[PDB]
Amino acid sequence: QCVNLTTRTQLPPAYTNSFTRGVYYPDKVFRSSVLHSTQDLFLPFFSNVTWFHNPVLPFNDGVYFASTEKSNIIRGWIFGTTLDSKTQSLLIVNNATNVVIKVCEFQFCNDPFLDVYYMKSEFRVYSSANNCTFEYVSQPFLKNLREFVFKNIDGYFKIYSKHTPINLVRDLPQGFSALEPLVDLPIGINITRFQTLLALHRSGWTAGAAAYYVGYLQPRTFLLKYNENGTITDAVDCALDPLS
Amino acid sequence: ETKCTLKSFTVEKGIYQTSNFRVQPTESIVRFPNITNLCPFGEVFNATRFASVYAWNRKRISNCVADYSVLYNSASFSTFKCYGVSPTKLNDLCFTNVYADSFVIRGDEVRQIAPGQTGKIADYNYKLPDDFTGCVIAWNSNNLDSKVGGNYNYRYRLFRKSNLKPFERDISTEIYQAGSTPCNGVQGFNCYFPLQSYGFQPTNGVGYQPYRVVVLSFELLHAPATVCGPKKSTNLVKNKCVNFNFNGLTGTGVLTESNKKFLPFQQFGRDIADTTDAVRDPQTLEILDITPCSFGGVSVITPGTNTSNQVAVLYQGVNCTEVPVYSTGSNVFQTRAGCLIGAEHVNNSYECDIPIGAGICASYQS
Amino acid sequence: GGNYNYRYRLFRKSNLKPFERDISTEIYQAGSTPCNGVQGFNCYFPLQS
Numbered sequence: 270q271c272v273n274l275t276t277r278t279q280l281p282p283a284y285t286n287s288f289t290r291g292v293y294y295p296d297k298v299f300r301s302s303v304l305h306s307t308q309d310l311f312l313p314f315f316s317n318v319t320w321f322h323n324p325v326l327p328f329n330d331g332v333y334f335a336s337t338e339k340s341n342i343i344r345g346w347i348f349g350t351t352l353d354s355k356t357q358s359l360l361i362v363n364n365a366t367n368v369v370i371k372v373c374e375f376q377f378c379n380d381p382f383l384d385v386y387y388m389k390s391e392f393r394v395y396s397s398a399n400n401c402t403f404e405y406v407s408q409p410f411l412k413n414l415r416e417f418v419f420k421n422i423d424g425y426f427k428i429y430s431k432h433t434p435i436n437l438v439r440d441l442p443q444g445f446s447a448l449e450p451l452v453d454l455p456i457g458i459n460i461t462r463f464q465t466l467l468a469l470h471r472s473g474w475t476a477g478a479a480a481y482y483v484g485y486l487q488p489r490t491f492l493l494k495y496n497e498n499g500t501i502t503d504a505v506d507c508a509l510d511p512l513s
Numbered sequence: 514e515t516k517c518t519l520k521s522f523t524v525e526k527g528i529y530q531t532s533n534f535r536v537q538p539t540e541s542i543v544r545f546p547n548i549t550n551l552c553p554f555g556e557v558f559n560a561t562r563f564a565s566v567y568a569w570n571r572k573r574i575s576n577c578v579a580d581y582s583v584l585y586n587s588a589s590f591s592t593f594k595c596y597g598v599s600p601t602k603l604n605d606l607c608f609t610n611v612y613a614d615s616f617v618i619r620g621d622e623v624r625q626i627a628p629g630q631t632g633k634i635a636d637y638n639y640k641l642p643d644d645f646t647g648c649v650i651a652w653n654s655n656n657l658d659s660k661v662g663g664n665y666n667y668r669y670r671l672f673r674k675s676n677l678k679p680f681e682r683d684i685s686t687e688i689y690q691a692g693s694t695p696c697n698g699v700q701g702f703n704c705y706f707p708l709q710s711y712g713f714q715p716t717n718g719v720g721y722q723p724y725r726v727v728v729l730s731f732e733l734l735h736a737p738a739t740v741c742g743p744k745k746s747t748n749l750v751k752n753k754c755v756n757f758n759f760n761g762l763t764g765t766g767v768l769t770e771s772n773k774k775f776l777p778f779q780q781f782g783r784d785i786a787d788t789t790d791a792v793r794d795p796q797t798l799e800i801l802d803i804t805p806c807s808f809g810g811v812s813v814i815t816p817g818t819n820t821s822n823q824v825a826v827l828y829q830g831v832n833c834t835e836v837p838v839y840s841t842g843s844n845v846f847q848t849r850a851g852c853l854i855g856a857e858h859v860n861n862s863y864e865c866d867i868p869i870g871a872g873i874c875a876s877y878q879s
Numbered sequence: 880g881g882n883y884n885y886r887y888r889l890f891r892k893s894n895l896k897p898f899e900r901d902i903s904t905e906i907y908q909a910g911s912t913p914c915n916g917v918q919g920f921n922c923y924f925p926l927q928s
């Protein structure tokens with residue numbers, strides 16, 4: 270149940286500066302007043318991050334997804350290789366109530382969207398649902414920037430999240446905040462690309478500015494400092510500058 | 514011990530180091546989370562209706578805490594026979610993707626369910642692989658699945674083009690030709706329905722009354738495991754040198770209360786020269802503290818076997834609280850170097866001949 | 880005619896020892912109930928031909 274979108278709204282793929290964002294707790298070990306060196310998948314400091322003002326983007330190894338969303342227009346994500354019934358696919362949705370995680374071989378068309386009538390009920394993303402393996406229901410995740418990290422290692426899918434109010438106009442703020450781990454999934458898929466979902470105002474769709482930022486992850490070494498209470502308060506890249 | 518270590522029958526005056534003192538563990542503690550995700554087992558063994566042998570009911574169970582001790586002890590099961598696994602260790606086996614094939618058959622075909630087994634329903638209704646692993650559970654259903662009017666709704670496949678592959682469901686409803694002429698869906702000569710009805714009746718003897726049989730199958734290390742036997746937990750101790758297995762993290766030490774404040778997502782803490790120091794119990798969710806049990810070296814002070822025959826014993830860097838013939842002995846002294854047994858502490862002062870440490874030393878007089 | 884006098888131990892309470900001999904024949908309890916020398920349910924003969 271979907272229609273081809275004639276009004277292919279343009280989201281220009283701009284480039285901007287990552288600064289010092291993309292720091293997450295790699296383990297579950299308490300530490301205090303210690304400098305710890307660790308080699309893992311991270312977002313390099315002062316990298317070059319893509320900005321969209323929903324095409325297909327490869328997953329690479331990991332994804333850093335940031336959104337200074339207002340009124341929660343972002344809906345969810347689709348993960349898979351071909352996003353068809355021929356390959357197992359994953360779906361994540363976060364509406365007003367409980368969030369839902371689904372693992373099935375759905376049927377996907379060119380423009381899967383949600384829409385909503387102003388009566389607030391509309392869902393026309395996929396057409397048919399095949400074999401379903403994993404079901405999950407949890408609590409809702411949600412001037413306010415939300416950052417997430419998506420990883421898939423050894424058949425385990427890891428989602429890290431962190432939200433924080435903001436006051437800057439457009440660019441990413443030059444602050445530091447670690448991304449505490451949120452959710453793990455014991456599902457092994459060959460995911461290589463992903464999508465995005467929007468809450469279009471079906472009232473004539475009104476969705477032309479979907480602002481978000483996307484970066485990728487590379488394996489390298491960082492040095493992290495733990496405060497007295499065990500929260501990461503500073504990080505330093507290794508292969509950035511001779512001083513590093 | 515001094516004479517043996519020095520490899521002599523005579524010893525000169527002085528202090529000599531000897532074997533090590535180590536406190537032994539007293540008992541054990543095992544702690545695991547209170548979580549008990551009950552597995553959906555009642556509905557598959559207590560169901561009123563079971564699918565037929567040709568249409569065997571296939572059920573998939575995942576993400577559950579599966580307990581088989583509550584089912585092994587059941588005596589209502591006519592047959593409890595597991596092939597690749599001994600029934601006693603099933604509670605200690607970790608698997609996932611549980612498959613259950615349940616059906617109702619006659620009493621004379623109960624033996625037909627086995628790896629590499631030949632028969633009628635074994636190759637025409639449901640087939641098990643030669644390398645089949647898991648278990649088979651069978652019981653009599655004459656009280657329920659048998660009626661005075663006869664349960665003829667149950668059909669078993671009798672005619673087929675060939676045999677059935679392992680894990681194959683054949684529910685095709687088509688006439689079978691037993692001659693050299695077409696049937697065209699007519700039950701004429703050499704044209705019979707491959708499925709035959711069951712004549713289950715209470716008056717029937719053994720081999721004829723209905724029997725409910727279900728086979729359970731598992732996977733062997735292909736995907737992350739989620740259906741595994743329950744893990745038992747033990748009580749908790751305090752201020753006693755024990756050994757612990759906190760959520761799979763094992764170690765020997767003594768546990769006290771800690772004022773450290775973790776963050777709501779860690780499980781344990783470590784320090785410089787990485788070693789576990791504090792842990793959070795999976796049930797109460799409280800931050801404890803771990804410190805190692807007392808240990809040290811012991812030494813002997815002697816004035817030389819040529820002069821006297823009595824010795825004094827010094828325990829290095831050990832509190833004068835856990836000392837244990839030289840457990841009480843004589844008066845005991847506590848010093849900055851440890852504890853001293855067999856010597857009298859005097860309040861005079863002389864020159865030092867046999868050093869002890871921390872500005873004190875001993876000599877012969879006693 | 881079938882050699883059946885050859886028997887082997889099938890069930891035991893625990894493992895054996897090197898160069899150890901076991902010849903005692905007793906009912907083996909396969910469950911959590913006493914056998915009382917009756918080979919019925921959860922009570923087997925450890926000797927197998």
Ligand SMILES: *[C@@H]1O[C@H](CO)[C@@H](O[C@@H]2O[C@H](CO)[C@@H](O)[C@H](O)[C@H]2NC(C)=O)[C@H](O)[C@H]1NC(C)=O
Nearest residue numbers: 362363364365366367368369389390391392406
């Ligand atoms: C939000 O998404 C959920 C996903 O199922 C929708 O489903 C209901 O959610 C409520 C609240 O958690 C549950 O009590 C119901 O049992 C759910 N129904 C089903 C069939 O699962 C929910 O309707 C959505 N809310 C909206 C669109 O406002």
Ligand SMILES: *[C@@H]1O[C@H](CO)[C@@H](O[C@@H]2O[C@H](CO)[C@@H](O)[C@H](O)[C@H]2NC(C)=O)[C@H](O)[C@H]1NC(C)=O
Nearest residue numbers: 301495496497498499500501502772773774775
């Ligand atoms: C780190 O932990 C300490 C101890 O819990 C925090 O200090 C407390 O802060 C609150 C809020 O300001 C006070 O009400 C308590 O009295 C403080 N406890 C003390 C002083 O022992 C501290 O705020 C935490 N954060 C940082 C950055 O130190």
Ligand SMILES: *[C@@H]1O[C@H](CO)[C@@H](O[C@@H]2O[C@H](CO)[C@@H](O)[C@H](O)[C@H]2NC(C)=O)[C@H](O)[C@H]1NC(C)=O
Nearest residue numbers: 545546547548549746793794795796797798799
């Ligand atoms: C794990 O489960 C046990 C069993 O219910 C919980 O123990 C209860 O804890 C509450 C909270 O203090 C007490 O009021 C009850 O009296 C306890 N009952 C029993 C039988 O122990 C325990 O709190 C749970 N732990 C968690 C959820 O972390």
Ligand SMILES: *[C@@H]1O[C@H](CO)[C@@H](O[C@@H]2O[C@H](CO)[C@@H](O)[C@H](O)[C@H]2NC(C)=O)[C@H](O)[C@H]1NC(C)=O
Nearest residue numbers: 830831832833834835846847848849850851852
């Ligand atoms: C051996 O352990 C005992 C027991 O903790 C110690 O005795 C404590 O000593 C401190 C300091 O003098 C007092 O504040 C406590 O009240 C004492 N506790 C008890 C129960 O008596 C003793 O100091 C330890 N020995 C050494 C050498 O550290």
Ligand SMILES: *[C@@H]1O[C@H](CO)[C@@H](O)[C@H](O)[C@H]1NC(C)=O
Nearest residue numbers: 284285286287315316317318
């Ligand atoms: C990102 O790359 C573009 C080139 O397309 C460049 O103009 C821009 O300065 C880069 N941003 C960085 C390095 O932060």
Ligand SMILES: *[C@@H]1O[C@H](CO)[C@@H](O)[C@H](O)[C@H]1NC(C)=O
Nearest residue numbers: 357372399400401402403610
């Ligand atoms: C469903 O897909 C899983 C793999 O994701 C597979 O193991 C399972 O056998 C499938 N079940 C059915 C009924 O297709």
Ligand SMILES: *[C@@H]1O[C@H](CO)[C@@H](O)[C@H](O)[C@H]1NC(C)=O
Nearest residue numbers: 357423424456457458459460
């Ligand atoms: C990915 O595909 C390969 C086949 O090319 C398969 O062997 C492997 O199990 C797949 N892995 C996952 C996680 O789906």
Ligand SMILES: *[C@@H]1O[C@H](CO)[C@@H](O)[C@H](O)[C@H]1NC(C)=O
Nearest residue numbers: 554555556557558559584587
């Ligand atoms: C079936 O019912 C009995 C009756 O109490 C119960 O003890 C048992 O747990 C139930 N489930 C199974 C699998 O036997």
Ligand SMILES: *[C@@H]1O[C@H](CO)[C@@H](O)[C@H](O)[C@H]1NC(C)=O
Nearest residue numbers: 523526816817818819820821
């Ligand atoms: C040491 O032994 C000798 C005997 O070999 C003895 O004559 C001497 O008095 C001893 N020294 C003492 C007791 O101080």
Ligand SMILES: *[C@@H]1O[C@H](CO)[C@@H](O)[C@H](O)[C@H]1NC(C)=O
Nearest residue numbers: 846857858859860861862863
């Ligand atoms: C040694 O201890 C005794 C015991 O009370 C005391 O009478 C004496 O004065 C002390 N000697 C010195 C030098 O303090």
